[PDB]
Design a protein around this nucleic acid. Sequence first.
RNA 1: GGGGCGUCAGUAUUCAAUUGUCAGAGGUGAAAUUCUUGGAUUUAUUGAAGACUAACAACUGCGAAAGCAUUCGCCAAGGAUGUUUUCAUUAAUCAGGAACGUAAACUAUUAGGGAUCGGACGGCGUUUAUUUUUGACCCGUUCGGCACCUUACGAUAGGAGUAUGGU
Lengths: 115, 225, 306, 60
Amino acid sequence: LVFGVARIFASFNDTFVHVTDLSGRETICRVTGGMKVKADRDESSPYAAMLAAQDVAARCKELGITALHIKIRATGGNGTKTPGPGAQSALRALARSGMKIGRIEDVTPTPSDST
Amino acid sequence: RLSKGKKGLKKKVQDPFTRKDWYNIKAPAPFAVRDVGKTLVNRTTGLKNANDALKGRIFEVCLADLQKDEDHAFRKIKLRVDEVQGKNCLTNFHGLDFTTDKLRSLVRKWQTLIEANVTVTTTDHYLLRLFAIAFTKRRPNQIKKTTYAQSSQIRAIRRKMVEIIQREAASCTLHQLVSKLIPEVIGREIEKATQGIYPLQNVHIRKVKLLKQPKFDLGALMALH
Amino acid sequence: ARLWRVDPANNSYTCYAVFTGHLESVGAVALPPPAFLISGSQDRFVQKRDIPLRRLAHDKDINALDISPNGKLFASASQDKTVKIWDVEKLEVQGILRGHKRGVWTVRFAPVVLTGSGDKTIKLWNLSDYTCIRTFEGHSHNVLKVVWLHFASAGADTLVKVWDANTGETECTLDNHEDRLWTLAVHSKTNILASAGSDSKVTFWRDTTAETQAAAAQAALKLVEQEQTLENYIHAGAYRDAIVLALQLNHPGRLLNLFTNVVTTRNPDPDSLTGLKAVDDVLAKLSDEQIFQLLLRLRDWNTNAR
Amino acid sequence: KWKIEPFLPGPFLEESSFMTLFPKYRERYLKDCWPLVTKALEKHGIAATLDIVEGSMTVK
RNA sequence: GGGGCGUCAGUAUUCAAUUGUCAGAGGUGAAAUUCUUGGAUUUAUUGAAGACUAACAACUGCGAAAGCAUUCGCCAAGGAUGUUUUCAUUAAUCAGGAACGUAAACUAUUAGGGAUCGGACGGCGUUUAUUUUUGACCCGUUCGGCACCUUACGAUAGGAGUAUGGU
């Protein structure tokens, strides 16, 4: 088994499923929700993240890593510091279509004092 | 389904995984397991060798699946990499952070926390900063809900903390420092020496940042590995 | 940019003319050995150069260029919703087209100019007044291509529709493609459209209005000839041929009147079924579909009681 | 397009766990109102313990 | 967490560089403007700039108000307590005067009690403590103050409709 780390940047507006190696620098594959759903209103849908996670898991098992460390984040500067329906449904679709999950971490940027 | 691009933008896509290739990572000495994973990186050739790329990158792995102990599920570490062999990638310590979930788990109302930051220089000319965090003890058999310490006690406790950390981090080398950091001896000694001025509920070293590395001693590096 | 000779009766294809031009990407190419070349730009440097000059036309990127058959006027299209017309020889400007709502994408000269723009509209303009002579709606995205006939207009809604400007209303719509559509050719002699998508599909269409017109006209010829022969058959009394022809031509009122008379001829054959052995013969030699349509007419005439 | 279907059916190698700390009045309320939370979390499949000594909720 | 001066850090934001990038990213109820194969958003590592000091954070603390929360160092001041410390009315009040400086929008005691912080005194004991210090926890006594509740001890401080006639 090979662990790859997936950053799920789940805003209220769009969702980003991003898969990198343990360094975090070498991008394996990324698929957003806007590139899978036509409506900008529906760009942040659990359906969007479901299709995105299906595409990403298909790609990374066609590569054959089958194991992911998951790091979820949200807009953290002046935003909400809470992830999205993209994050929840994407994680669900991922570990349904395979992808032995290792360590989960909610790494959001939390400012000490912003504005 | 239907594309949306501008006129003449989508070039021909190329498979990158042809020129992408694997490299087994190897961990330094004091951790229990050496194999930590694999790294996909671009293939080497002229015009920016993958040797230079792999010298560039850094890694982040967790002490749980390093020590094979779920007690260190927090306290994630960061490893630089300076060496490369055939299909192998030796690593060296760079940093130690906690989990933000662990910090939020540790903060609590009606008890105070004291932080301390120190800039220590170990024997190997490594300049590093240690940020330690300590939460005040709630004494058994008490009725008063708030366990507040006066500001004089807080400053004296931070002074003792800086003294203890500096005295037990300026005597040893980096390998001895991380062999100290793994079983958390430093927080134990801080508690043992500060409980006389004010008892502390728990003392952790929440961050360890190596700022400057001045040497490239492959002898010492392979001595670790 | 460059210019190439094609040699059909050899395997020789050279790029023997080259042009450096400007610093951005050249946008479009216009040709009236050839006369000269006019090159567009991603920047605002429109250029003109001969084969063995610069100008600033718009603000945004410029898109498409076209030359008249005689090579006297020259129009340029751009994404700042303006069409710039000027002279091909000197550096002068012969006028400016006033505006198409979003941004013009392609222009065309009429062997009178046409503009296909960013909004879902397409305009026909003139030289003499610089006013849009005609306007047309009907698309769902950008249009990106207008091609004259012997016009047709693409969209980016995988739909290419042809009509004529003098009438002003849509004639025919073509939906072979998947998602997108970029271009369109035409045979110089006959009407052959080449629609290519951003998908790999390239469909070729040919005109068929003349062929179906001749076919329908010949159908009209045979219709009036056979109708008059049916009227002659009725007026003569050749009930057998009249029944055959009325069954081939499908009008049941005359069919029913013929059937009433053959049922009551007032002089029946004794061994016939309906009175006349000829009518028995045609009812025997009926094919299956004719039997079915006869069953339909018989259901109706049985619904009635007279 | 927006509806989330209920998950029908080992997806965890490392036994994950989260922790949080609380004060004493919250300890009183959490102790006499805990079994509801642990029934619902057992229905979802998560072991949850409360520590009234340290004052810590743990889910794993 | 009173002020002034320097110094130390922490993130985040913006900007920039490098690398992996490969079609959108960004809003919004929905859009759009905009940025986008010269690679946006994103991922990883740095550097610079400017800001502020989350959680701890209170029915708390400080200052005369406005106001005051990163560490450390310096500088003066200030409050409370204790004294086996002094001068002995030096006092109180405010004309005049002097120093500090986008908003609003539901509103001589009371007589004790339970909290609270700052001293001080005490002492059955747990813990520092390898045993004296000393500090932490408990409780009792005495000053002082920010607030709670209870007690008062009392007090006191035209509008809307419907008509009529003029302008």
